[PDB]
Amino acid sequence: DVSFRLSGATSSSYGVFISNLRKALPNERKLYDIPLLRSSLPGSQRYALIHLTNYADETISVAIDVTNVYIMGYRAGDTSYFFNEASATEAAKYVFKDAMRKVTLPYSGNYERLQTAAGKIRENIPLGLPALDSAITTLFYYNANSAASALMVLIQSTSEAARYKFIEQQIGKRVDKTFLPSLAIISLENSWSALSKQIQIASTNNGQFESPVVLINAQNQRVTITNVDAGVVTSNIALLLNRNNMA
Ligand SMILES: Nc1ncnc2c([C@@H]3O[C@H](CO)[C@@H](O)[C@H]3O)n[nH]c12
């Protein structure tokens, strides 16, 4: 398992947390020095627990699928909560088995559903370590109507930070304040699957993408990425989704 404690947290200890999270994920290949995640794992190998404790020392345990870094669900005390999606109901066979209450949330973990549920777009939801503390409290004392927003903070602070060094750094920086994510952060989140696919193709195609990926940069300009010498590939993306999880 991996653990993060918010009381006494710093930029450093968040980075340590995100390094350990990445290290928890199995990979057989690296392409261009980036971990390629596995295609398929048996159930007893597929999930990892991360334990998160907020400033008030309230803890939740979050189950992630190690093949795609998706959050399956979380446990707060004696109740477990799973997303309403097939991989999450598969996971519920293996994780949090001793939990007395299990609730299935009214939505999957995909952003279009979550934003609809939250009634807020990603750009308008604060991130930063204090936002993560607040998300843990909101899920700990589960309130259906705050949950969606909190799960979006949770996913971006764990999954998305693990996938990209830029997102890890932007979040870790904000120790005692919060910030609204730019479109650069959102475009990376949107494009993880496509980038992963093209980087796998590139390795068979002399480092050239078969199809460009349009990202938005730190200056908000739409940029078209076509090969593995682009900075997003060289210096940012930290994990690759296996083409077999692209369909
Ligand atoms: N259970 C889950 N956990 C995390 N992310 C997602 C998603 C979303 O699918 C995309 C994968 O990069 C991105 O929009 C991500 O948050 N669907 N299901 C998920």
PDB file of C-alpha atoms in Angstrom, residues 54-245:
ATOM      1  CA  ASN A  54      -6.465  14.596   6.217  1.00  0.00           C
ATOM      2  CA  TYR A  55      -5.438  17.342   8.674  1.00  0.00           C
ATOM      3  CA  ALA A  56      -8.027  16.167  11.218  1.00  0.00           C
ATOM      4  CA  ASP A  57      -6.509  12.654  11.035  1.00  0.00           C
ATOM      5  CA  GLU A  58      -9.504  11.187   9.243  1.00  0.00           C
ATOM      6  CA  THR A  59      -8.465   8.401   6.816  1.00  0.00           C
ATOM      7  CA  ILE A  60      -9.897   6.898   3.620  1.00  0.00           C
ATOM      8  CA  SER A  61      -8.432   4.010   1.616  1.00  0.00           C
ATOM      9  CA  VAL A  62      -8.717   4.272  -2.143  1.00  0.00           C
ATOM     10  CA  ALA A  63      -8.518   1.258  -4.487  1.00  0.00           C
ATOM     11  CA  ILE A  64      -6.832   1.801  -7.857  1.00  0.00           C
ATOM     12  CA  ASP A  65      -6.670  -0.534 -10.817  1.00  0.00           C
ATOM     13  CA  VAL A  66      -2.910  -0.773 -11.571  1.00  0.00           C
ATOM     14  CA  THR A  67      -3.452  -1.355 -15.327  1.00  0.00           C
ATOM     15  CA  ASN A  68      -4.976   2.078 -15.990  1.00  0.00           C
ATOM     16  CA  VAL A  69      -4.568   3.922 -12.667  1.00  0.00           C
ATOM     17  CA  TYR A  70      -8.396   4.255 -12.408  1.00  0.00           C
ATOM     18  CA  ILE A  71      -9.959   4.785  -8.969  1.00  0.00           C
ATOM     19  CA  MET A  72     -12.419   1.892  -8.376  1.00  0.00           C
ATOM     20  CA  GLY A  73     -13.811   3.092  -5.060  1.00  0.00           C
ATOM     21  CA  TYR A  74     -12.868   3.956  -1.498  1.00  0.00           C
ATOM     22  CA  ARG A  75     -13.503   2.866   2.078  1.00  0.00           C
ATOM     23  CA  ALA A  76     -14.442   5.115   4.983  1.00  0.00           C
ATOM     24  CA  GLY A  77     -14.545   3.198   8.231  1.00  0.00           C
ATOM     25  CA  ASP A  78     -16.949   0.298   7.771  1.00  0.00           C
ATOM     26  CA  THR A  79     -18.542   1.414   4.515  1.00  0.00           C
ATOM     27  CA  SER A  80     -17.167   0.997   1.034  1.00  0.00           C
ATOM     28  CA  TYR A  81     -18.193   3.050  -2.022  1.00  0.00           C
ATOM     29  CA  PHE A  82     -17.722   1.911  -5.607  1.00  0.00           C
ATOM     30  CA  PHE A  83     -18.294   3.695  -8.906  1.00  0.00           C
ATOM     31  CA  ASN A  84     -21.154   2.409 -10.976  1.00  0.00           C
ATOM     32  CA  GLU A  85     -19.039   0.822 -13.678  1.00  0.00           C
ATOM     33  CA  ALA A  86     -18.071  -2.718 -14.681  1.00  0.00           C
ATOM     34  CA  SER A  87     -14.405  -2.614 -13.655  1.00  0.00           C
ATOM     35  CA  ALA A  88     -15.475  -1.210 -10.280  1.00  0.00           C
ATOM     36  CA  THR A  89     -17.939  -4.074  -9.728  1.00  0.00           C
ATOM     37  CA  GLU A  90     -15.178  -6.522 -10.700  1.00  0.00           C
ATOM     38  CA  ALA A  91     -12.874  -4.828  -8.146  1.00  0.00           C
ATOM     39  CA  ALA A  92     -15.477  -5.108  -5.392  1.00  0.00           C
ATOM     40  CA  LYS A  93     -14.789  -8.857  -5.575  1.00  0.00           C
ATOM     41  CA  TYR A  94     -11.249  -8.310  -4.271  1.00  0.00           C
ATOM     42  CA  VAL A  95     -10.990  -5.126  -2.231  1.00  0.00           C
ATOM     43  CA  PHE A  96     -12.607  -3.925   1.031  1.00  0.00           C
ATOM     44  CA  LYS A  97     -14.157  -7.353   1.496  1.00  0.00           C
ATOM     45  CA  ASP A  98     -14.673  -7.016   5.266  1.00  0.00           C
ATOM     46  CA  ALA A  99     -16.557  -3.721   4.910  1.00  0.00           C
ATOM     47  CA  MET A 100     -20.023  -4.035   6.432  1.00  0.00           C
ATOM     48  CA  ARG A 101     -21.833  -1.511   4.188  1.00  0.00           C
ATOM     49  CA  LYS A 102     -21.117  -1.301   0.449  1.00  0.00           C
ATOM     50  CA  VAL A 103     -22.664   1.535  -1.529  1.00  0.00           C
ATOM     51  CA  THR A 104     -22.652   1.813  -5.301  1.00  0.00           C
ATOM     52  CA  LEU A 105     -22.357   5.475  -6.370  1.00  0.00           C
ATOM     53  CA  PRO A 106     -24.927   6.728  -8.955  1.00  0.00           C
ATOM     54  CA  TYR A 107     -22.249   7.373 -11.606  1.00  0.00           C
ATOM     55  CA  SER A 108     -19.092   5.919 -13.131  1.00  0.00           C
ATOM     56  CA  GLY A 109     -15.725   7.588 -12.630  1.00  0.00           C
ATOM     57  CA  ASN A 110     -15.640   9.329 -15.968  1.00  0.00           C
ATOM     58  CA  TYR A 111     -15.280  13.119 -15.997  1.00  0.00           C
ATOM     59  CA  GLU A 112     -18.279  13.825 -18.204  1.00  0.00           C
ATOM     60  CA  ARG A 113     -20.545  12.036 -15.678  1.00  0.00           C
ATOM     61  CA  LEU A 114     -18.780  13.470 -12.620  1.00  0.00           C
ATOM     62  CA  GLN A 115     -18.846  17.076 -13.865  1.00  0.00           C
ATOM     63  CA  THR A 116     -22.544  16.702 -14.716  1.00  0.00           C
ATOM     64  CA  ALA A 117     -23.129  15.261 -11.228  1.00  0.00           C
ATOM     65  CA  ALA A 118     -21.025  17.969  -9.588  1.00  0.00           C
ATOM     66  CA  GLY A 119     -22.593  20.724 -11.673  1.00  0.00           C
ATOM     67  CA  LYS A 120     -19.107  22.146 -12.150  1.00  0.00           C
ATOM     68  CA  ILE A 121     -16.423  21.821 -14.837  1.00  0.00           C
ATOM     69  CA  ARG A 122     -12.881  20.798 -13.955  1.00  0.00           C
ATOM     70  CA  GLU A 123     -11.495  24.323 -14.578  1.00  0.00           C
ATOM     71  CA  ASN A 124     -13.695  25.649 -11.763  1.00  0.00           C
ATOM     72  CA  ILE A 125     -12.775  23.134  -9.093  1.00  0.00           C
ATOM     73  CA  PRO A 126      -9.820  24.105  -6.826  1.00  0.00           C
ATOM     74  CA  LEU A 127      -6.803  21.790  -6.546  1.00  0.00           C
ATOM     75  CA  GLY A 128      -3.855  21.901  -4.153  1.00  0.00           C
ATOM     76  CA  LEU A 129      -3.123  20.094  -0.885  1.00  0.00           C
ATOM     77  CA  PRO A 130      -5.823  21.973   1.087  1.00  0.00           C
ATOM     78  CA  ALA A 131      -8.337  20.970  -1.604  1.00  0.00           C
ATOM     79  CA  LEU A 132      -7.268  17.338  -1.111  1.00  0.00           C
ATOM     80  CA  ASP A 133      -7.798  17.639   2.666  1.00  0.00           C
ATOM     81  CA  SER A 134     -11.289  18.989   2.015  1.00  0.00           C
ATOM     82  CA  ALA A 135     -12.054  16.178  -0.499  1.00  0.00           C
ATOM     83  CA  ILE A 136     -11.058  13.533   2.053  1.00  0.00           C
ATOM     84  CA  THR A 137     -13.417  15.080   4.678  1.00  0.00           C
ATOM     85  CA  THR A 138     -16.292  15.273   2.177  1.00  0.00           C
ATOM     86  CA  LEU A 139     -15.902  11.583   1.244  1.00  0.00           C
ATOM     87  CA  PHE A 140     -15.195  10.457   4.831  1.00  0.00           C
ATOM     88  CA  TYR A 141     -18.498  12.016   5.920  1.00  0.00           C
ATOM     89  CA  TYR A 142     -20.117  10.976   2.649  1.00  0.00           C
ATOM     90  CA  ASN A 143     -22.650  13.453   1.375  1.00  0.00           C
ATOM     91  CA  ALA A 144     -24.026  12.413  -1.991  1.00  0.00           C
ATOM     92  CA  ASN A 145     -24.256  15.988  -3.150  1.00  0.00           C
ATOM     93  CA  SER A 146     -20.624  16.967  -2.504  1.00  0.00           C
ATOM     94  CA  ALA A 147     -19.110  13.630  -3.471  1.00  0.00           C
ATOM     95  CA  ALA A 148     -18.720  14.193  -7.247  1.00  0.00           C
ATOM     96  CA  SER A 149     -16.624  17.356  -6.865  1.00  0.00           C
ATOM     97  CA  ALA A 150     -14.517  15.653  -4.156  1.00  0.00           C
ATOM     98  CA  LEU A 151     -13.921  12.570  -6.285  1.00  0.00           C
ATOM     99  CA  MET A 152     -12.664  14.813  -9.097  1.00  0.00           C
ATOM    100  CA  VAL A 153     -10.122  16.390  -6.754  1.00  0.00           C
ATOM    101  CA  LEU A 154      -9.205  12.897  -5.563  1.00  0.00           C
ATOM    102  CA  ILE A 155      -8.662  11.522  -9.091  1.00  0.00           C
ATOM    103  CA  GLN A 156      -6.644  14.527 -10.271  1.00  0.00           C
ATOM    104  CA  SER A 157      -4.479  14.534  -7.131  1.00  0.00           C
ATOM    105  CA  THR A 158      -3.645  10.806  -7.454  1.00  0.00           C
ATOM    106  CA  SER A 159      -4.223   9.305 -10.921  1.00  0.00           C
ATOM    107  CA  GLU A 160      -3.516  12.384 -13.016  1.00  0.00           C
ATOM    108  CA  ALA A 161      -0.524  13.416 -10.905  1.00  0.00           C
ATOM    109  CA  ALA A 162       0.907   9.885 -11.392  1.00  0.00           C
ATOM    110  CA  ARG A 163       0.498  10.076 -15.172  1.00  0.00           C
ATOM    111  CA  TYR A 164       2.152  13.505 -15.658  1.00  0.00           C
ATOM    112  CA  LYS A 165       5.088  15.239 -13.924  1.00  0.00           C
ATOM    113  CA  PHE A 166       3.582  18.667 -14.737  1.00  0.00           C
ATOM    114  CA  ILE A 167       0.350  17.903 -12.857  1.00  0.00           C
ATOM    115  CA  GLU A 168       2.279  16.418  -9.893  1.00  0.00           C
ATOM    116  CA  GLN A 169       4.379  19.588  -9.714  1.00  0.00           C
ATOM    117  CA  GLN A 170       1.474  22.016 -10.074  1.00  0.00           C
ATOM    118  CA  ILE A 171      -0.509  20.358  -7.279  1.00  0.00           C
ATOM    119  CA  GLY A 172       2.455  19.739  -4.965  1.00  0.00           C
ATOM    120  CA  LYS A 173       3.423  23.401  -5.144  1.00  0.00           C
ATOM    121  CA  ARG A 174       0.169  24.463  -3.464  1.00  0.00           C
ATOM    122  CA  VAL A 175       0.696  23.457   0.163  1.00  0.00           C
ATOM    123  CA  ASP A 176      -1.324  26.128   1.955  1.00  0.00           C
ATOM    124  CA  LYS A 177      -3.297  27.616  -0.906  1.00  0.00           C
ATOM    125  CA  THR A 178      -5.462  26.316  -3.708  1.00  0.00           C
ATOM    126  CA  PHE A 179      -5.551  26.993  -7.454  1.00  0.00           C
ATOM    127  CA  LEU A 180      -7.770  26.505 -10.462  1.00  0.00           C
ATOM    128  CA  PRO A 181      -6.259  24.148 -13.084  1.00  0.00           C
ATOM    129  CA  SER A 182      -5.346  25.683 -16.454  1.00  0.00           C
ATOM    130  CA  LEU A 183      -6.399  24.238 -19.786  1.00  0.00           C
ATOM    131  CA  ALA A 184      -2.861  22.823 -20.004  1.00  0.00           C
ATOM    132  CA  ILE A 185      -3.694  20.469 -17.096  1.00  0.00           C
ATOM    133  CA  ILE A 186      -7.147  19.627 -18.551  1.00  0.00           C
ATOM    134  CA  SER A 187      -5.710  18.908 -22.044  1.00  0.00           C
ATOM    135  CA  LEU A 188      -3.136  16.498 -20.582  1.00  0.00           C
ATOM    136  CA  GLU A 189      -5.929  14.732 -18.701  1.00  0.00           C
ATOM    137  CA  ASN A 190      -8.061  14.582 -21.867  1.00  0.00           C
ATOM    138  CA  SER A 191      -5.151  13.292 -23.993  1.00  0.00           C
ATOM    139  CA  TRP A 192      -3.491  10.577 -21.875  1.00  0.00           C
ATOM    140  CA  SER A 193      -5.015   7.733 -23.889  1.00  0.00           C
ATOM    141  CA  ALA A 194      -4.207   9.218 -27.307  1.00  0.00           C
ATOM    142  CA  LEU A 195      -0.639  10.145 -26.301  1.00  0.00           C
ATOM    143  CA  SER A 196      -0.077   6.638 -24.924  1.00  0.00           C
ATOM    144  CA  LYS A 197      -1.357   5.047 -28.137  1.00  0.00           C
ATOM    145  CA  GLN A 198       0.744   7.253 -30.424  1.00  0.00           C
ATOM    146  CA  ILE A 199       3.887   6.781 -28.336  1.00  0.00           C
ATOM    147  CA  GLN A 200       3.467   3.008 -28.695  1.00  0.00           C
ATOM    148  CA  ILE A 201       2.962   3.444 -32.457  1.00  0.00           C
ATOM    149  CA  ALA A 202       5.949   5.835 -32.669  1.00  0.00           C
ATOM    150  CA  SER A 203       8.221   3.100 -31.337  1.00  0.00           C
ATOM    151  CA  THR A 204       7.448   1.091 -34.453  1.00  0.00           C
ATOM    152  CA  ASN A 205       7.473   4.144 -36.737  1.00  0.00           C
ATOM    153  CA  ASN A 206      10.841   5.780 -36.170  1.00  0.00           C
ATOM    154  CA  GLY A 207       9.512   7.950 -33.375  1.00  0.00           C
ATOM    155  CA  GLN A 208       6.774   9.462 -35.493  1.00  0.00           C
ATOM    156  CA  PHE A 209       3.111   9.538 -34.388  1.00  0.00           C
ATOM    157  CA  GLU A 210       0.621   8.142 -36.859  1.00  0.00           C
ATOM    158  CA  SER A 211      -1.901  10.769 -35.752  1.00  0.00           C
ATOM    159  CA  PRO A 212      -1.050  14.165 -34.145  1.00  0.00           C
ATOM    160  CA  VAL A 213      -2.275  15.029 -30.668  1.00  0.00           C
ATOM    161  CA  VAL A 214      -3.401  18.634 -30.082  1.00  0.00           C
ATOM    162  CA  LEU A 215      -2.550  19.864 -26.594  1.00  0.00           C
ATOM    163  CA  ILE A 216      -2.916  23.264 -24.998  1.00  0.00           C
ATOM    164  CA  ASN A 217       0.272  24.672 -23.609  1.00  0.00           C
ATOM    165  CA  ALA A 218       1.095  26.789 -20.570  1.00  0.00           C
ATOM    166  CA  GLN A 219       0.363  29.836 -22.745  1.00  0.00           C
ATOM    167  CA  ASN A 220      -3.040  28.478 -23.725  1.00  0.00           C
ATOM    168  CA  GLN A 221      -2.085  27.956 -27.334  1.00  0.00           C
ATOM    169  CA  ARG A 222      -3.235  24.844 -29.140  1.00  0.00           C
ATOM    170  CA  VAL A 223      -0.141  22.891 -30.139  1.00  0.00           C
ATOM    171  CA  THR A 224       0.076  19.869 -32.426  1.00  0.00           C
ATOM    172  CA  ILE A 225       2.329  17.067 -31.189  1.00  0.00           C
ATOM    173  CA  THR A 226       3.705  14.642 -33.828  1.00  0.00           C
ATOM    174  CA  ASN A 227       6.686  12.759 -32.388  1.00  0.00           C
ATOM    175  CA  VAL A 228       8.622  11.601 -29.341  1.00  0.00           C
ATOM    176  CA  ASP A 229      11.033  14.576 -29.292  1.00  0.00           C
ATOM    177  CA  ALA A 230       8.180  16.835 -28.104  1.00  0.00           C
ATOM    178  CA  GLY A 231       8.572  17.991 -24.505  1.00  0.00           C
ATOM    179  CA  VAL A 232       5.364  16.331 -23.333  1.00  0.00           C
ATOM    180  CA  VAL A 233       6.984  12.999 -24.232  1.00  0.00           C
ATOM    181  CA  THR A 234      10.572  13.760 -23.160  1.00  0.00           C
ATOM    182  CA  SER A 235       9.885  15.547 -19.899  1.00  0.00           C
ATOM    183  CA  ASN A 236       6.310  15.149 -18.707  1.00  0.00           C
ATOM    184  CA  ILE A 237       4.256  11.992 -19.343  1.00  0.00           C
ATOM    185  CA  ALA A 238       5.300   9.417 -16.687  1.00  0.00           C
ATOM    186  CA  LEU A 239       3.124   6.370 -17.467  1.00  0.00           C
ATOM    187  CA  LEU A 240       1.737   4.778 -20.637  1.00  0.00           C
ATOM    188  CA  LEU A 241      -1.683   3.137 -20.997  1.00  0.00           C
ATOM    189  CA  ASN A 242      -1.285  -0.151 -22.808  1.00  0.00           C
ATOM    190  CA  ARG A 243      -2.748  -0.092 -26.327  1.00  0.00           C
ATOM    191  CA  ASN A 244      -4.815  -3.102 -25.301  1.00  0.00           C
ATOM    192  CA  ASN A 245      -6.754  -0.867 -22.896  1.00  0.00           C
TER     193      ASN A 245
END
